[PDB]
Subunit: 467 residues, 4 copies
């Protein structure tokens, strides 16, 4: 699993010999990848979310927990007991799939809404057979009333759960399968209605149920810990300012962060331990991203003793030891005296963290992609497979075996293929990473292996008529 | 208290001698009042909500409970402990007041938004002094971002609580009173922000907190029970159909209704007890009024064994013993084979039950006004006071003593005066009752005293040029 | 016609002997009718629109002109030539009818959306026959996508035109009549589509076509002139301020107003003529009511030499001889130093002038109802007919002949009956007049016959339980 | 000028010797450029707009005409006479600029809203000086209330006009320059207000003024004619279907198209002339793109004899010689029995034609970029200049002269630089072309030089971690 890769790298001590780093940064696994050039010396503030960037949740343990609690919630509100026999399977869901609430399919699409993979339950629908429901092998992906795009890591159990349910109702004799849902005499459950229940249940688990409590009760089981995290953060604070802006509330943030910094030392072995808050020039919780990058909400102050909000809108200045709640990205800029391009924001939400901070504020962006830590291994190991496909393509271009090679390549990633492509065709997610993430990597810790004023470089882009 | 009046009438046995009823209906206390003529023989369906029509909550016990739990909730989220020393005072709030979130005032207004009473906390602001904040002694009451109209019985504790809070912060030395809220150094709590917290807390208490549980745990303390309720309902079912459409969920509805019908007999003394559901041709919960009278929500079916919803949209026909959830007013009409003017709908929400069913569907309407049971007593007893005002008015009209008489009249109702007027000026609430409630009374039980095919009558209306 | 009544009164000289006025005001024809009490001494500003209050358009000449030009426009865009044989008929349309774009009917309804009259083309649909399309004999009149309410005087030709068209297509053999429109082989014209064309054509005629030009080219034919208008306005300016706020542009306003004041004298015979602008403390054109009573538009200044707008938002103060364009009702209040209840606004639009200024700003209101000048004559002459109906009603109430009496009464007003009622049932329009017009009359000139500080009086209102 | 290039190519006879074409297609000027691979053999329908694809308007004559009429319109509504001394200057505007209505600047930006060029009037604001108004040298370009993106060819005069006006008011002593507009005593004209007037005037000229009439009165002066247009269209009709979908009305379309086909021959010299409509399997006018690619409008049929719409929604089938009006892209698909990827749509609106048909329907797209015909010449001629910049960049990257080289390169395109870049940075427009236009060229006629089943090819895309 990708978190196993991350954990193994996490257990390593960080030898800060520059000659070691310069050659350690070269390994693809520890590389920072570059979509648009970025001069690190111009970055004056380093900003973070917490989800899967600071707090790396262990896979598949965390997904299974969320899956299990979501299933229990559905059963709790009246779904059949048989749901309880579901068990999370990490090999099925690929992140970034689109659930079609009309026909109950999971779709993998490219940036233009072309179908690359279609599955109904666990049945993979071949090209011709998809044309009945998708005449142009295409969806309008911004039709948000019909399509839901599962591009978060938290979406992974939900992704698998949707397929389990379609599979279950399809094969349960009590039900009759219809085009848009399931009939049970005088009851009709549409896929849309089903999807809404799943949505509700997942949200409930996350914010009202026992997920956070189960998580903090057993942090060693659910959360990766890395001694290098305080090291990197302390190095960032030497050359600029460091801030936290998370959607989580203070109570959860404090529990998780305390754990993440729980070593018998500070930044480096031998140094005194320091509380996690001391690593940040500004701490902001209840961020409500992506709204945060627009109007946001009123700026509040957290009573860190009680973990409740103080009464009133906070109107004061940045003060040492203060914790903020809500506000907006402008809050950060004002308090830290920064401009957007002075900021490198590090996050795991392609939409809510990266796309939005880039498009709305022109922040510089770093996207953490936890799966990359494994997708790389598969890509480098089965490289020959892709290289063959490329050869088969350019040969045919200058003129069905391609489909089999496509299939065999994709299956090494999972049943839903790579996060980034299906054979030679890039996914929507891949196109969004390239377009909005200035930098990306399996972990932001990979920044440790690059010098203070490194210039990350991407090739200039030319139009076809310019080439 | 008005519920004491209702309780005393409730304890009475119903002698169905027609000569007794014809003369019993004459007492103002047991009368049904008429705004627009209504032939009862044309009514084919009698419909009900549950809140304060079937389930008469005891005053001030129920209001105090809701007040106490709301205060605890505010303290729970970080308001000062001193809130706990508040105690509900039934003499202060009159229903139907407008809270101005800009300036933190409770206002009593007429149908045209003219100010009749203005109070800041417990300080009553005289006419001239209101002109500073209300230059035209007027508000645009449909500006719903600024003004919140507290016209439900459930709104009564909230009404008092808002004044308590304004009073508390005004007189708490830790705070500085500003035009639009309270300053505490680097914190500023606007009245708007305060109001939002109170709104949230009240909603939470009602739907997530312990109000329903505290209520059902001690029904004798909190809910009026009347042996005449099953009698009247059984008489309605003889001449037409009877339905329930409540916003409450089934579990609460079943608890309350079971209690309301808990006598050692059925409709009449000596008869076998019958379960409450047998009194209804159609039972619908989770109604989501007022949306119910528009598009509504999808029609669901309740699993009455588990109190959970069955899976799927219910597509079947009206069946004996079925309980519905959601749907819309059209559901009722279709299933009962009724047209709007065939329906007399009985409710306690001037907006959500009465105004909306009238305007959206042309239903006939009966408004239960629990306070009337006391307001009448005050009106008939202090009649001379009003009669004097009338004389003082027509005398001046054909030409400040009026203000003192106005004051002394209004104080007999409470500090916020009558629900229906301030001196000679009618409230917004009164104008809405007249406009949208075809019939009204302190209790719908008053229908018992009228014969099967009574013709309720109001005088025809003439324009001034027609007179 | 009503404008004949107005013209006859207009030709009269105004004898300002107070004994004459006090007894002249008594004639119903010259009365100001009162819905809510109004002390004239408290009014500090008198405000006017121009349409049918200052500029009384002659009937049926003006309606016929607008009708003719609208028909020509429809033919111009491709409707059949046969339309040209239509001719305006003042006896058919009553103001305030609702056009149902689904079924192509004109409806007369009460305040609650109950059907009083239904006509398809020129065919009057009896009660039972309407139930097929209107099961509850009711419409939701605020469903503005389906229903259009024709309550302006300018709406009168459009009202008749809609019926002409439904009649024409119904009886033209080239077309097949369907429930929602007309079929012509591969073409289907819905009533909705038809209605939209008529709407567009009417708007075009009014703002881009030759209506205004045809009007100003022959003012004597199209506009009533009254020597008493400058007299009354000059008397208003003695005791307070006078303003104009019209939707018309300056060029049209100046043409019309110049004509209205074109006498060889000023306020009184023998006095020097004064230009119309000198009668106003503030002149505002392009008002864009009803938006005017909300946010309005930016305040502009008219270059009265060129009749074009000066460049820029006007930021200066009230200046003598300035003409404003756009702005909002707040503009008036600020510049004149008035509060809403200091203002009596006189207009002919029940919605755009009266309802909106009342509800949004708490202005005092005077509604001019030109038809009243004839409706009164019919009401007073055929009084016995109504009196019979009243007797027949109370007799039956204490127990189909009523329907015949209803019919015979209504036909004296026109085919669509009185503006104010159908038999004993009040129209929506009547209920709106009572609710929002503080005062009303056939002409605002009727104010001339009342003294400076008259107290207009309406009886106090009592609820049924208060009576 | 670019239209001179197009005209010169237009005058050439088309030698259809395949060996000539294969080597003629190679010249960059006659090339079709490829962003995403496209197999022409899969294309079953060729679709067209008319603006600048079929009807190539001569530059700068057409822009000057539109400019002149727009200026006259502004003067007509009250702008100062001095405007009349403006004269269109083709060297100033580059297409695709953003007008900032807050500060009155024209901006050239990249895909991420970074400022590349800023001009206030004709004053070019250097980098540091822009930071006062643009702290992050960035705009949120989708803030459509503030920013207007001038990316159409019709936008070119408006672009120049906005700068003329800012220049004029800035230097006219009667006015005082403020941050957000111009003061003239009691008048304030904001740049926003000014921009709205210009918008209105341009729209008026285009749809109510004399632009279309002036154009059709002298087609030889304003419109490029090419004998190869009927040749290519006839070749397209051999292998698939051909349709027209334009926003223009039929009367204008017929005038223009008749002219475009006015030769003494048909497809090839010597052949009989054929009317323009015979080249199309489907003709649709009043398309209302981009709405056309969503819900569209109701499908109408044009009476081609009168040029007016027939009465009714057209419900029939595709018929020979029928002309449609409105409808939606689904209309095309249904009538032609096509799926989106079967369609190559050729247009000149990057947003309304290309982006929308691609994103909403998955059509294949061909973008005509008239300026390319000159931008290429500048690019190939001054190639060394760009090559130097590239060298200076990679040298510095591996380490202000760059700025001077950037400047000198950009000035060869105009004062606002290349449509596609500023030095090494690509414009928003360039990024949109690459993302949404599958193919592009200076003229669609360039398709003539490619064989029936050509495979247009673009290189597969790889992520940085995949490289």
């Amino acid at each position: 699993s990708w978190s196993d890769r991350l954990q193994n790298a996490a257990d390593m001590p960080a030898n800060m010999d520059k000659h070691a780093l310069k050659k350690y940064r070269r390994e693809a696994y520890h590389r920072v990848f570059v979509n648009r050039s970025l001069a690190m010396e111009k970055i004056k503030c380093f900003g973070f979310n917490m989800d899967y960037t600071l707090a790396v949740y262990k896979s598949p343990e965390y997904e299974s927990l969320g899956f299990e609690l979501t299933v229990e919630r559905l059963v709790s509100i009246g779904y059949p007991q048989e749901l309880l026999s579901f068990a999370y399977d990490s090999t099925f869901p690929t992140r970034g799939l689109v659930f079609d609430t009309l026909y109950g399919n999971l779709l993998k699409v490219d940036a233009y809404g072309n179908l690359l993979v279609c599955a109904h339950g666990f049945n993979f629908i071949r090209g011709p057979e998809t044309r009945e429901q998708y005449p142009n092998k295409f969806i309008q992906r911004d039709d948000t009333e019909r399509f839901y795009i599962l591009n978060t890591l938290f979406n992974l159990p939900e992704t698998y759960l949707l397929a389990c349910l379609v599979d279950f109702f399809t094969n349960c004799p009590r039900y009759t399968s219809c085009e848009t849902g399931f009939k049970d005499g005088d009851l009709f459950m549409s896929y849309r209605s089903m999807f809404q229940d799943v949505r509700d249940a997942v949200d409930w688990v996350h914010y009202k149920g026992s997920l956070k409590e189960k998580t903090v009760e057993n942090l060693e089981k659910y959360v990766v810990k890395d001694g290098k995290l305080p090291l990197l953060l302390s190095r960032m604070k030497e050359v600029g300012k460091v801030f936290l802006a998370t959607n989580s509330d203070y109570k959860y943030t404090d529990k998780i962060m305390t754990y993440l910094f729980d070593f018998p030392h500070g930044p480096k072995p031998g140094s005194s331990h320091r509380p996690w808050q001391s690593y940040f020039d500004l701490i902001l919780v209840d961020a409500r991203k992506p709204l945060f990058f627009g109007e946001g909400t009123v700026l509040r102050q957290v009573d860190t003793k009680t973990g409740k909000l103080k009464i009133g809108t906070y109107t004061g200045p940045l003060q040492h030891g203060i914790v903020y709640s809500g506000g907006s990205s402008d809050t950060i800029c004002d308090l830290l005296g920064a401009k957007g391009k002075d900021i490198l924001y590090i996050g795991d939400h392609i939409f809510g963290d990266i796309l939005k901070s880039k498009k709305r504020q022109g922040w510089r962006t770093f996207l953490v992609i936890p799966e990359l830590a494994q997708e790389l291994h598969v890509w480098t190991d089965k490289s020959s497979l892709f290289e063959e496909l490329q050869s088969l393509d350019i040969f045919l271009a200058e003129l069905r075996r391609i489909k089999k090679v496509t299939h065999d390549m994709d299956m090494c990633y999972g049943m839903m293929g790579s996060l980034f492509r299906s054979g030679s065709r890039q996914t929507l997610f891949a196109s969004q990473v390239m377009r909005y993430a200035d930098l990306y990597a399996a972990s932001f810790i990979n920044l440790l292996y690059y010098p203070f004023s490194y210039l990350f470089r991407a090739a200039h882009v030319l139009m076809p008529h310019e080439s």
